[PDB]
């Protein structure tokens, strides 16, 4: 396997094992990602932050510190968006696979925010 599968893996695998409400789909909507980065000169080290930073985020979206969030949210936000562009760079035989899975990207997200989030709102 690509060490960018890899590099994606040792976050999500912690975010599957924690949170395994949804230990799936964690992992595959962002391997499958990790592949479409590789498409896009993108490093190991390019990616291993954004995950672990998508951990901060969620466990922090967990105990609560709105600001370790926002921090985390941030900072995986600022590296995703260089490189859907560098993928935006791409041929429209690329694009058409990017422009159908991102929805999902943003379907994993916006489910597992709302969901991790009611978790807490739930004493």
Same mark, same amino acid.
């Not at 190991?44 to 672990?52: L, M, N, Q, T, W």
């Not at 466990?59 to 969030?69: F, L, M, Q, V």
């Given at each position: 396997l690509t060490p960018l599968q890899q590099a994606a893996l040792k976050w999500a695998r912690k975010l599957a094992e924690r949170f395994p409400e949804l230990g799936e789909e964690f992992i595959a909507v962002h391997l499958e990602e990790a592949r479409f980065w590789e &498409? %896009? $000169?993108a490093t190991? !080290? *390019?990616? =291993? %932050?954004? $995950? &672990?930073a998508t951990l901060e985020y969620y !466990? %922090?979206?967990?105990? $609560? =510190? *709105? !600001?370790? %969030?926002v921090e985390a949210r941030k900072k995986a936000l600022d590296i995703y968006n260089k490189i859907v562009e560098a993928l935006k760079k791409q041929p429209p035989e690329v694009v058409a696979a990017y422009e159908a899975f991102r929805p999902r990207h943003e379907a994993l997200h916006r489910r597992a925010e709302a969901t991790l989030r009611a978790q807490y709102e739930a004493r």
């Open positions: &498409k %896009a $000169g190991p !080290e *390019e990616v =291993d %932050a954004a $995950g &672990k !466990e %922090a979206i967990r105990n $609560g =510190d *709105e !600001e370790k %969030a």
